[PDB]
Design a protein around this nucleic acid. Sequence first.
RNA 1: AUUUCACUCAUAUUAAAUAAAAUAACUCCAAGUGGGCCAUUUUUGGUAAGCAGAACUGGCGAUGAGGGAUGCUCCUAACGC
RNA 2: AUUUUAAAAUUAUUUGAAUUUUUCUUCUUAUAAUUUAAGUUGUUUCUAUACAGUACUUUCUUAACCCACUCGUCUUGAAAC
Lengths: 180, 124, 223, 35, 66, 155
Amino acid sequence: IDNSLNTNIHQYHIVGRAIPTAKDKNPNVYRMCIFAKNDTNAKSRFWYFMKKINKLKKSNGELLACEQIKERFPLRVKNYGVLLRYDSRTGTHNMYKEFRDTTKEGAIAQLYSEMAGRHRARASSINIIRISEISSSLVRRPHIKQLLKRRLRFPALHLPTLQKEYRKKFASKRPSTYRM
Amino acid sequence: AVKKVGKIIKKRTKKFTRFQSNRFMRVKPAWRKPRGIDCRVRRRYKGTNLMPSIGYGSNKKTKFLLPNNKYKYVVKNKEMEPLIMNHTKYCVQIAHNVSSKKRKQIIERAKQMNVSVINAKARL
Amino acid sequence: AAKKIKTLKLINKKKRNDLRQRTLRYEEEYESERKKIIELKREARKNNCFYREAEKKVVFVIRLKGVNKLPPKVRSVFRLLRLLQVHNGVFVKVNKATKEMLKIVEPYVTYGYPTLSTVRKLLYKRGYVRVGKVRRYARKKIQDNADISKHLGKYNVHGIEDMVYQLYTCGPVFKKVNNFLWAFKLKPPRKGFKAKRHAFNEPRPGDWGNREAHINELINRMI
Amino acid sequence: KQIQKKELQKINHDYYKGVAKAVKKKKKREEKKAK
Amino acid sequence: AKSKNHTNHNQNRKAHKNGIKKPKKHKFMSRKGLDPNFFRNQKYCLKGIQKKKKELKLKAKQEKNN
Amino acid sequence: KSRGKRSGTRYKFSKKFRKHGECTANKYLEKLNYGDYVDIVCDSTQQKGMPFNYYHGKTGKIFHITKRGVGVLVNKRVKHRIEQKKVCVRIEHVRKSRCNEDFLLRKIKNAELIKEAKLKNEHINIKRKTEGPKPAAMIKVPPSKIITIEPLPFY
RNA sequence: AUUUCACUCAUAUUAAAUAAAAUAACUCCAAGUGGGCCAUUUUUGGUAAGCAGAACUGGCGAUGAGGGAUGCUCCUAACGC
RNA sequence: AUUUUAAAAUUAUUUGAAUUUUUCUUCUUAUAAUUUAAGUUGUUUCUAUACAGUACUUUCUUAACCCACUCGUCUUGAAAC
């Protein structure tokens, strides 16, 4: 495990309720699972979603439960379909994307990197929705379709990345990116 | 740089010179506080004839004492009576307006008194 | 004329033994609280019911920005809450009014729930005490119990672990202890802040705002 | 700790079941709103 | 030469530099010209009570001083 | 260029909607005492005995009573200091306040509670509560009423 | 309405909170000042202006230190050695 | 030279007890010192076995990395073309 390699996203589960009032004796308790860096950001984003959908904020409400959802199996290969809602500089769109990796945390991190690279959509301008595992049959994007062939194999054209211990400033003769 | 010698701890050397006393003869090296308006030194620009302030004053526990670990005191003709008791604390200097005969007698008395003299070899 | 010395010695011994018993009861209370919270959460998960713990009622807060370029109301609230330097820190009781006035200073501060080890470390390590006469306090490190018994022992809180308990639990004595305890001077972080210019709860990296349980980590480098 | 482990399995299972039902209901509503 | 015809900048800061001064709030307020024909009676009231109290004071003083 | 008496009262002094006509025939019957706290409200049906532009909405106390005039002491800000000002207004415009009915009710409650509290020799936190941190307790909710929430799509 | 007596209304945390709240309050003598400007936000005239004119606040002037290559006002931050 | 003391701890005795159940287990009855108490003390050299020197302290001149716009002035704005 390397801190540089790993990201900092954890699935969080939040349950909350408005304070019981005289006008409405028992309010409908709400529950929702979201992705964030840590529990404080999870609570903030949860309450923001509350303020946007249901008529309720911090002062006239409170929390009930705040837990962390971790994976059942960290070393399996799955496929994830996630719906989005983001806003461009000139409009607002939604779109559905696919991703393949070990866990929902990595899937969300990969998705955020994808958005930043492909649409310059900054982090605060994103909304995740209805992320769910999907079967191999029902994947909708060919660039993840071809990954699940019967028996994959390919070369290793990636250039070497050696340690600072040996990234010296001089050498004996020209190396080769061919390698194996 | 601060100079450290024994117990006397001095924080500054290079007696400060007046601003612009380099390229103007009429301005003498004696320091003054330039008043000016856009006079640079008052504004305290980065590295240009920094001015004296109270913070450079040495410690009063060791302030006036001379590298001899001993305060200096001037003498004129025969005024050695108040020096007998504090011979470990006060060194004696002959006043520059003393003739050879009087200076000779003073040096004679002081040497047997066992008190150091600064300008022992004056005018001889 | 000499009985006084021995009488004072027995007084000191009695104070020592009483403080011993006090800290034993306090150590009982802490472990009792931890056991109770664990068992209550387990029971909640066992049944179809949920358990939430109330806010910790005491908040440690640190100032982040300098002195220039502040709104007059902001500066007045800082001077009223005793955050004078740029790395001073204080404890505050939690009330709706206090939180409301903290709401108008949130952008320039970082506030959260203490936790016990770090409050103990702050009291022992960076703690300083107003000692002298009123308005002439002449801040002085603790190093002892004589002065704390002299001025604050009247309310029977003489000692140091008494302060630890009286702080970690919202008890009878705050307007005395917090007024007695000089504002904590904090060292810059061991690694550094994330972004002074952005909120913590923002998805972008940032620091200012509400950190709740996380403040202890950053205090452990503040020290 | 096996009894608590069973309980935790059950509660997280119920959470995911609720989420899946929400997904299915939203999908059905989208299909209805399609035409 | 054009001259700025008005400003109110920095006025509030100047006011609060010395702090917003408060009136001293003394206890009694004078009755120089407030609703006469009532304090006209009140002055006689005070004179009468003072006269009775002081005459009793002098009576006690004499009967104790012989 | 113009700073007359009623300047800039096109709406402030205007009587509110469906409130025209003379002042209520019971407002004359209020009882006033020296030392009471009072509010100043400029009504427009009455014309003489009128307050001025700034004083609408302020408070004060009663220190002068005539056949119909009422003199109220007010703190009016001027630059660097506050100076007392006595304003003479009329009964139609003046109006009994509520700034002290809370404290009066609190005092009455104190008188009728701490009497028996002292009789029993009990100490109470008679200072106002200012409810802050709620306590921690256990609550129930069946799984049949937990309604999830999820962000909404676009349209 | 006044005076004098009764009686007594938390006061041991102090009639809510928090307060390097008495660094206060007052009185006296007196200099300089009385052409301002920039910045986020609000806003008047003019097409616009580094324009003319106002508004709550902060700065500059009265002030340097690190950064923006460089800059009277930007960001961090205000200075004993 | 009338708080470098008190206790605080440590060792070695002794006292009764205790408990997490014993070689840093704790609480003192009584004893003598240690210091983690009660702001750095010791050891070996060199200066050096000399009376002015190449050492040692200092003044001055040269260079070297970094920085530094002619002052005084009226001015919102001065190094100013």
